């Protein structure tokens with residue numbers, strides 16, 4: 001589970 | 007469903 | 013380069029390249045459109061950001077694969093395999109830096125300076141922070157602190173304008189906060205600040221959801237869920 | 248171009264590029280290795296085929312997206328949107344043709360002529376048929392029949408050697424038959440021949456599975472399942 005960016 | 011090639 | 017194609021044709025082509033998942037082409041078409049010198053519309057700024065985010069996201073994922081190999085080759089008991097892993101990680105790194113530099117150049121010549129509305133100015137400053145952050149992910153030398161500080165300064169200016177000029181539920185504000193929080197967590201060694209920022213942002217957005225239409229609600233809750241995914245991962 | 252890098256370094260890099268899903272780099276590293284002029288090992292021929300199959304598979308999928316858009320733009324009641332869709336489909340088409348031409352050139356200079364063992368000769372001729380077939384997927388003019396016939400002739404020579412020199416379960420034989428059957432079905436307008444070839448190939452392989460080790464069995468049954476998937480789709 002990789003941290004989210006947008 | 008697309009036909010298979012390899 | 014794309015100098016002889018009409019701006020509208022470049023835009024039309026960028027949309028076709030996106031449909032075709034041809035993100036390098038999409039980015040080059042958008043670069044040509046920016047280079048026409050006119051400001052970008054909302055939809056056009058989105059296309060520009062999507063194109064480069066995909067290109068650089070492919071390069072970053074490859075760099076991480078190669079970095080991890082290179083690190084394993086440097087552990088005790090690993091056979092020397094020669095310079096190839098390092099050389100090829102460097103090659104991918106250099107290409108990734110060149111893409112960051114291209115985007116940063118477009119922002120500096122002359123997207124940011126002509127962006128007067130909050131929604132445009134914050135968008136481009138968030139991009140500036142994001143591409144300095146990708147440079148920081150690979151930085152290892154003399155300039156690393158300054159690259160980190162450039163990412164910080166850009167995100168901070170975007171935070172300050174977004175706080176003053178945009179509602180707490182605005183997707184640009186939420187995405188900016190999400191990314192600045194990631195910057196804090198993994199670039200600036202400030203996991204507390206990253207957590208605090210994601211929490212405060214999520215909570216302030218929750219409290220303003222009541223003002224929104226169904227479509228705006230869906231837009232904002234989508235990025236809020238990304239803030240929550242990080243908080244869940246980090247706490 | 249890759250002329251100054253050692254052949255083994257090119258091979259090592261191609262394997263790293265595959266791990267990193269950098270298939271364009273992988274293909275260029277393999278092209279450089281072929282250009283060193285030494286024959287390829289089994290594993291190296293596999294790398295060469297994987298690299299280009301992925302590159303061209305990305306271009307073909309994009310071309311199909313763009314082709315379908317272009318066709319919809321040409322139906323009754325569609326707004327004229329100008330030349331952009333056609334131009335951009337042409338651009339992707341030209342790049343795809345250039346990749347086919349590069350591979351066909353590597354095969355002709357001088358992979359095929361130096362390949363003496365059945366496993367190498369059939370492999371490269373199957374590649375020759377596959378890349379002429381990708382050229383045929385986009386061909387619309389004077390040369391289309393000749394391009395189709397080039398694909399046919401290459402597959403046929405590979406079929407003839409494979410029948411004589413390889414067991415019916417050999418993965419190369421099975422993959423060759425799978426692709427030549429696709430060629431018949433969708434390029435040469437011979438769905439009966441495509442079906443007949445996939446069926447006969449599958450059945451002859453079934454009958455020889457008993458000779459195989461567990462690992463060889465798994466290898467052969469995997470491609471046999473592809474023959475079955477096509478027969479299921481086409482019947």
Ligand SMILES: COC[C@@]1(O)CC[C@@H]2/C1=C\[C@@]1(C)CCC(C(C)C)=C1[C@@H](O)[C@H](O)[C@@H]2C
Nearest residue numbers: 006058061062135136138139183184187188
């Ligand atoms: C520069 O920052 C760009 C961005 O990260 C800030 C938030 C988000 C951005 C990118 C993108 C164009 C891609 C992902 C989304 C989604 C959330 C679909 C969008 C838009 O649809 C949003 O309205 C919004 C502009």
Ligand SMILES: COC[C@@]1(O)CC[C@@H]2/C1=C\[C@@]1(C)CCC(C(C)C)=C1[C@@H](O)[C@H](O)[C@@H]2C
Nearest residue numbers: 012293296297370371373374418419422423
């Ligand atoms: C030129 O034709 C190449 C090919 O289509 C002929 C059959 C198959 C080929 C490609 C590839 C390298 C990629 C997919 C597979 C799989 C079936 C895993 C392999 C090998 O592992 C097989 O042993 C075998 C050589």
Ligand SMILES: [Mg+2]
Nearest residue numbers: 089090091092
């Ligand atoms: Mg050892």
Ligand SMILES: [Mg+2]
Nearest residue numbers: 051126127128
């Ligand atoms: Mg302005």
Ligand SMILES: [Mg+2]
Nearest residue numbers: 324325326327
């Ligand atoms: Mg109309």
Ligand SMILES: [Mg+2]
Nearest residue numbers: 286361362363
């Ligand atoms: Mg030989």
